[PDB]
């Protein structure tokens, strides 16, 4: 007989299977459509989620109840030191999809990216790319031949870039290497851009700008094996239930005489690849710029780092991207920020946000002071110091 009271199904069947992502770095499965009149540019960037904070800004939304008023908003900080371009990959199109024809690497690779090709770096002889670097022996004839092949072919061009994880406070020391599509015209000049940027750094400010809508692609925080109640949001069974209540009561009818794929089951929760779109960049700040956390309204010379450091992360010392709201992935996780795949014009995008104040109170507690100088001024002199 029928369900006898309608309810929406629990969970989204389009995010199946709820299995662990095959890699800790979520793959970018779609790049922005190529407009071949614009200059050559990366379609994405690699960063490390540092943590969240809060900002105050005047809302610009005519017709809204809070128009020209002050709104407090949550923001996520992504430590984004410049990425080192170390190679180029050419992609030809086939009746069976895109296919990598050849990859041309830079002559010199840093130990950061070399560690990525090693499970046991400490006891290896570090022979990686030693014979490849010999292709630059006298004139780089083989490198030029491969680049000529990429120009003659490879309707899609991607650069291989790696993070400078040594500039982050992470203990990993092993760089993250990824392919970033080169948008802009003339595959020939895509290859020229890649070759000219071999062994060179590209900063996040050359990829992204303020008020831009971007997408965050990351593996979510893992939670291990989870019951249906929290994995799918199913109703808790009554307290009277024998054999447990954090379950689904009926996991299927008599026919089909099988548990169906659509029924909520206990299993792995979190550590899933997610691509969340339309996150507005609130700041493109620079590590070399002190007063990173300052605004035109605050003028207090302070960095983006909260007092005591970002909890479980450390201090931001590099370029950083501050996006509105929250993004998938936990602190210290590698995330990929990609340009939006469409042109959003909705007055939520295209809104020019000007931060009035960035919170730098300690996230290790109920932080009361934005700066150590402010703590000094409020508290007065102490016994130890001050």
């Amino acid at each position: 007989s029928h369900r006898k009271y309608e309810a929406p199904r629990h969970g989204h069947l389009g995010f199946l299977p709820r299995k662990r992502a095959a890699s800790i770095r979520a793959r970018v499965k779609a790049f922005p459509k190529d407009d071949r009149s614009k200059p050559v540019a990366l379609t994405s960037f690699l960063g490390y989620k540092a943590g969240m904070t809060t900002i105050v800004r005047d809302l610009d939304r005519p017709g809204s109840k809070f128009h020209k008023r002050e709104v407090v908003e949550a923001v996520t900080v992504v430590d984004t030191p410049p990425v080192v371009v170390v190679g180029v990959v050419g992609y030809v199109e086939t009746p069976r999809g895109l296919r990598s024809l050849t990859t041309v690497w830079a002559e010199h690779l840093s130990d950061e990216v070399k560690r990525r090709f090693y499970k046991n770096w400490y006891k290896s002889k570090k022979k990686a790319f030693t014979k490849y670097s010999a292709k630059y022996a006298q004139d780089g004839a083989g490198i030029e031949r491969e680049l000529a092949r990429i120009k003659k072919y490879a309707s899609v061009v991607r650069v291989l870039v790696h993070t400078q994880i040594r500039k982050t406070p992470l203990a990993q020391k092993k760089a993250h290497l990824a392919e970033i599509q080169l948008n802009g015209g003339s595959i020939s000049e895509k290859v020229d851009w890649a070759r000219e940027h071999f062994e060179k750094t590209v900063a996040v400010d050359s990829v992204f700008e303020q008020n831009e809508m971007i997408d965050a692609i990351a593996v979510t925080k893992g939670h291990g094996f989870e019951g249906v109640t929290h994995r799918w949001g199913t109703k808790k069974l009554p307290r009277k239930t024998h054999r447990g209540l954090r379950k689904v009561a009926c996991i299927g009818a008599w026919h089909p005489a099988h548990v169906m794929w659509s029924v909520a089951r206990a299993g792995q929760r979190g550590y899933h690849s997610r691509t969340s779109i339309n996150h507005k960049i609130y700041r493109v700040g620079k590590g070399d710029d002190e007063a990173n956390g300052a605004t035109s309204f605050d003028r207090t010379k302070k960095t983006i780092t909260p007092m005591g450091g970002f909890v479980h992360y450390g201090e931001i010392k590099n370029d950083f991207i501050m996006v509105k709201g929250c993004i998938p992935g936990n602190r210290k996780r590698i995330v990929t920020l990609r340009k939006s795949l469409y042109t959003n014009t909705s007055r939520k995008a295209l809104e020019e946000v000007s931060l009035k104040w960035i919170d730098t109170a300690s996230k290790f507690g109920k932080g009361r002071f934005q700066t150590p100088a402010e703590k000094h001024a409020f508290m007065g002199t102490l016994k130890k110091d001050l």
Binding site: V56, E70, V72, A361, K366
Partner: protein, 63 residues
């Protein structure tokens, strides 16, 4: 933005921090955190709570 003052402890309240309590008589109390909020609800006197600005002022601490 304007930095508020804790009605109980006198600590600086930055935007989003703590809570705001509107009493029956429409008096407004701002608490920087749940510690001061809970002490106020317990009806403790800030003049007796040794870490508050009011206590330190009444006891001539720091000045």
């Amino acid at each position: 933005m304007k930095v508020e003052i804790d009605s109980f402890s006198g600590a600086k309240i930055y935007p989003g921090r703590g809570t705001l309590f509107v009493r029956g008589d429409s008096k407004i109390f701002r608490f920087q955190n749940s510690k001061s909020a809970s002490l106020f609800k317990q009806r403790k006197n800030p003049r007796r709570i040794a870490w508050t600005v009011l206590f330190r002022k009444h006891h001539k601490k720091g000045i």
